[PDB]
Design a protein around this motif. Sequence first.
Motif, PDB file in Angstrom:
ATOM      1  N   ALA B 198       0.829  -1.213   0.000  1.00 41.80           N
ATOM      2  CA  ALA B 198       0.000   0.000   0.000  1.00 41.80           C
ATOM      3  C   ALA B 198       0.866   1.267   0.000  1.00 41.80           C
ATOM      4  O   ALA B 198       0.577   2.223  -0.735  1.00 41.80           O
ATOM      5  CB  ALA B 198      -0.917  -0.002   1.221  1.00 41.80           C
ATOM      6  N   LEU B 242      -6.129  -4.416  -2.415  1.00 46.68           N
ATOM      7  CA  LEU B 242      -5.226  -3.482  -3.111  1.00 46.68           C
ATOM      8  C   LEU B 242      -5.693  -3.108  -4.539  1.00 46.68           C
ATOM      9  O   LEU B 242      -5.007  -2.348  -5.213  1.00 46.68           O
ATOM     10  CB  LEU B 242      -3.795  -4.029  -3.161  1.00 46.68           C
ATOM     11  N   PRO B 285      -3.992  -0.199   3.238  1.00 44.32           N
ATOM     12  CA  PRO B 285      -4.480   0.302   1.941  1.00 44.32           C
ATOM     13  C   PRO B 285      -5.521   1.427   2.094  1.00 44.32           C
ATOM     14  O   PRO B 285      -5.494   2.389   1.335  1.00 44.32           O
ATOM     15  CB  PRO B 285      -5.066  -0.958   1.290  1.00 44.32           C
TER      16      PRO B 285
END
Lengths: 305, 297
Positions: B198, B242, B285
Amino acid sequence: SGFRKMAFPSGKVEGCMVQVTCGTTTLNGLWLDDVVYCPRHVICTSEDMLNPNYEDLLIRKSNHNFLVQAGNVQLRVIGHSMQNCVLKLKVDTANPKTPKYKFVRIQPGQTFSVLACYNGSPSGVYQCAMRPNFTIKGSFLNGSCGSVGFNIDYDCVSFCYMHHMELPTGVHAGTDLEGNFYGPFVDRQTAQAAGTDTTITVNVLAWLYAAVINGDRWFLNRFTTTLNDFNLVAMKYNYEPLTQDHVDILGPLSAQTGIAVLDMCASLKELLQNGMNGRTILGSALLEDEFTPFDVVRQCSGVTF
Amino acid sequence: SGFRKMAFPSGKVEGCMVQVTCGTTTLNGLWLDDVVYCPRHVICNYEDLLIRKSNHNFLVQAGNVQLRVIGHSMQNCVLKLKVDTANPKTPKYKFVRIQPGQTFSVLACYNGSPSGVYQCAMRPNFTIKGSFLNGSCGSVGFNIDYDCVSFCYMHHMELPTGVHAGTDLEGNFYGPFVDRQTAQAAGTDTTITVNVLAWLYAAVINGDRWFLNRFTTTLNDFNLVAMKYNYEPLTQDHVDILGPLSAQTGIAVLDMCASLKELLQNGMNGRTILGSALLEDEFTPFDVVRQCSGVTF
Ligand SMILES: O=C(Cc1cccc(Cl)c1)Nc1cnc2ccccn12
Ligand SMILES: O=C(Cc1cccc(Cl)c1)Nc1cnc2ccccn12
Ligand SMILES: [Cl-]
């Protein structure tokens, strides 16, 4: 134990954030008593920014052109004046959540908390430092103008920064709460660039003392240095010169750990020469310069490990 | 531009912090409605120690105002003190138990007075790398979703390595820890893989692309590599989570995994990513999406 980049609790500042709109522009304002402080570029168009004549743009405005919003309540503007690059909007309601406060102009190397806001609404709080080149490495998006930097030592909020612009390198420029910019910057869309930045030497030394307080001594050596020889070396690594004021300011941390400032300077010289060799200091693989001598004393214990 | 370790605005939590004293011990409490929540070790079999205490033994202080305790009960490792005054500053809240890898803001307090706010993550070994001194017990961890504060952590103790251990707001510890003076140690820690990825996407968003390469990998090949470097296994759930960051930058999750594999085997080589010479794993994330979009509360 432990060492974190710690911000001041933001509650006293959250209760002052308002949204300021003028025409198409929307940014943040700081509502203290019956005055709302915001960047004067709120009266500008993007075209105006090349060479704005703020006095000429302001004389054309009336009180009812400025829309101020505190939560879901509209505040009525009853006056306006400009002080340097800040616009002061007189409102009909005093903020009941106004804390004990001061406006303070800080020097490079000083740290502060930033409450990043969008549409008069707080989104985050982070800690940062006024760089030697008078910029701040912040985290800001469009709409964050008017967000403020502060310290809350005791129960008094010291406002020291108001956000105005992002420079081409991604760094940020702004003013104190009297509207005076930090650095040679102007609230104009002209070729402006941050000067070459340097490392805040007194802050790296403070952070090395914090590591010793937390039990780490691997970086220390048996050598000492003169202040002049340290500065001749420091300049070569783009470190700020260390003054006798910095040496005096590091006195308490030197007494608490038993390591003289010039012996800590010798250890810094060696770290600059050798690197960390796969080791870290306080969970960091780089030398940290955004903790001042005062932040180390505030966060760390009074008893060395 | 810019990427900082950002905490939630702490104001809604500041209005809940109180000081709790019992005998010689002084620590922090969380005052929500007419109940003050604090670690049960403030009384130091906890039922036998508690039955010997009366309501007036617990001194609760909210600012410069003494609150009167009218009842007490224990729920796991948290003490619930019933008070005669409901907190007028009580916000909309939930008690939530978080998973390792998740992040939260900590409002560190001493004597019921908030002194600092910082961001941190629940490590895979259930400890937190916080910054606390003696008197910090009862300090809380939280997230804010819209206008609702989600309390997820209450501080109880420091382990010998300098790391911290605590409970959710229902008194259940994170990790195999107990609230007593006994030989306890943090287990071997691992890196939160989905969080490093992330943060690599956040670096690309901020204009850092030197670590990108033409290669891609499989989840199976990457997991062998990750296990060799003490990285947590990457699941298909992590890959799905993600997805948005992958679409925004045009870098497939397994394309970014090959970049991480190269950084793990070759190092950074005198370079940094977002001002860091180490791979950062304390931004989820969702934290990256929130900071690179300006979500407010
Ligand atoms: O830079 C400006 C507009 C502007 C242009 C020229 C001069 C002045 Cl004073 C202001 N706004 C802004 C502030 N922070 C950010 C982050 C990202 C994008 C935009 N940001
Ligand atoms: O760890 C304890 C005392 C304690 C002993 C035995 C069991 C329990 Cl639950 C608590 N206090 C504490 C918390 N955080 C810190 C930071 C620094 C020093 C001390 N700290
Ligand atoms: Cl200063």
